[PDB]
Each structure stands twice: as structure tokens, then as C-alpha cells.
Amino acid sequence: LKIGSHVSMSGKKMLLAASEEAASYGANTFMIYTGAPQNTKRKSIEELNIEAGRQHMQAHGIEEIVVHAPYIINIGNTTNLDTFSLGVDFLRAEIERTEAIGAKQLVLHPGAHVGAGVEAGLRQIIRGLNEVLTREQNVQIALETMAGKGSECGRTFEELAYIIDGVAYNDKLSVCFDTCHTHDAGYDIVNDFDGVLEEFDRIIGLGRLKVLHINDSKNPRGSRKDRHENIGFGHIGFAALNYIVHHPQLEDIPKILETPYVGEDKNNKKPPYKHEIAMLRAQSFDDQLLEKINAGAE
């Protein structure tokens, strides 16, 4: 099973640090943004230290990398035309960076209507994707299932299907399924994950599911809040999350944790990934996981 987490793509080491971080958590896959997750400021390809990173990955059993576009990209914006056009330009460049890094999937929050309404937002996202995609690219944009917080589009499978249907080179589109987002959007992944996966297959198609984000949620089903929670400490729970991670239909899909760092105070936060990955591999919930992370225990 391919299980990992988001890791930082930063500093002078860039991809090498990302791989070192992933290996330190016992991950065999990882997800990175191509720079700061909250902005479009980026380094050149040469500065990404890709060959050092890939050599380290090979030496540590890391077989697949996923890339995520900055969360500020908004090709659903119909109000600020610079936001839209800059998003389009950035994504074209991001696909080239992703191809250079050797990842096949570039995760993208579809877009947000920011007040123009879902219908308008969906039309705009289709326009943006049609301006971005080339027939030659060897990367797929994995549209992420969203929680529906704010003005997010992509809260339902039908919204994603509508976008996909409007894109010419839609063979370049895939989907990233996030457990916190789908639960928050209203899908019953706690009691009927198979039903949600079947609904996904019927509306979008499992052939397009290329990345999984494994997160518990701080809120009830349908809350539309998007506040991730450590594995088994939220409203989704260990049993459901573990079931998804080991699902017979999702064996070849990378599973990426994006759970919150652990710590009572803001100035002392530690990654939970090593412990969460081991817990999921053991298939046994550990009620003292947060205690252990907040002390350095195993």
C-alpha cells in the first residue's frame, strides 16, 4: 500500500528535503507543493534539486510523488480577471514543473465562485481548464473533491462531472478524493464508504480517481467546514479511515495524510505522520497517539 503525507518542498535542499522528510515518517509516497502552499512565488527547475531527491527516493522505497497546486489558485473567479488569468498562466507552468519532478498527478482545488454563484463558477473553471490543458502534457490535473466551505465549487460529484464534461482534453483530468472534504460535503463515508465510492463511480468514474487524501474531520457530516483532524480523533473515525486506506478497489492509489500538526500551543507543533502511518499499517487505533507525538514516544 502507498501511504504518505504532505511534506515540505523548501530550503536549499528542495526535493531532497521533501524525500528525507517523507522517509523519516516511514512513507513510501509523498505530496508536495512546488513552493510555499499559499503563494505563486517559485524557484526554477534547476533549483528544485530533482535528481538528488529522486536518488534519495529510490534508496528509501519511495515510488510515487504527487504535486499540489497552491491553494490560492482560483480559475473559478469571474470577478477579478487578473486572478483568473494569472491562475491559468500559473497552472501551465505548474504542469511543466510537475512533469520535471516526475509526478503524474497535479492536485487542484477546482475553484471558488467568490460570490458569483456556483453555476458561474463552474463555467469559469471549464474556461480556465480549456486554456490550460495541452494535448501533449504527460501530467493530469487531479480536481479535488471539496468540502463546500466558502464559495468552493466541486463540493459534489455532479459539480466535478459538469466541469469534466466541458473540457476538451478531459483525458488530462483526474480526481483527488479527500475523506474530510467528502464527509464535510455530506457524503456518508462513515457508514457507507462503498456507497459513496459507487456514487463517485457512477457520476465521475473510478478510472479518474488518482489520488486519495486521508484526513479525519473536526466536524459532523455535512458541516462544510474543512477542518482536518488527526486519524481517528474526529467525526469520521479510525474504522472508516482505515477501511478506506486498505480498500480492495484503491490498492494502487497513493494515500496522502494532510492531518494537523500536534501540540497544545501554537509555538510547539509537531508532524503526526510517522505515528499515523504506523497506526494505519497496524490497523489498530491508538487513543494515546497525540500524547505520544507530544512527547516523542513511539
Ligand SMILES: C[As](C)(=O)[O-]
Ligand atoms: C485542500 As486541503 C489541504 O484542505 O485537504
Ligand SMILES: [Fe+3]
Ligand atoms: Fe487540497
Ligand SMILES: [Fe+3]
Ligand atoms: Fe486535501
Ligand SMILES: [Zn+2]
Ligand atoms: Zn481540507
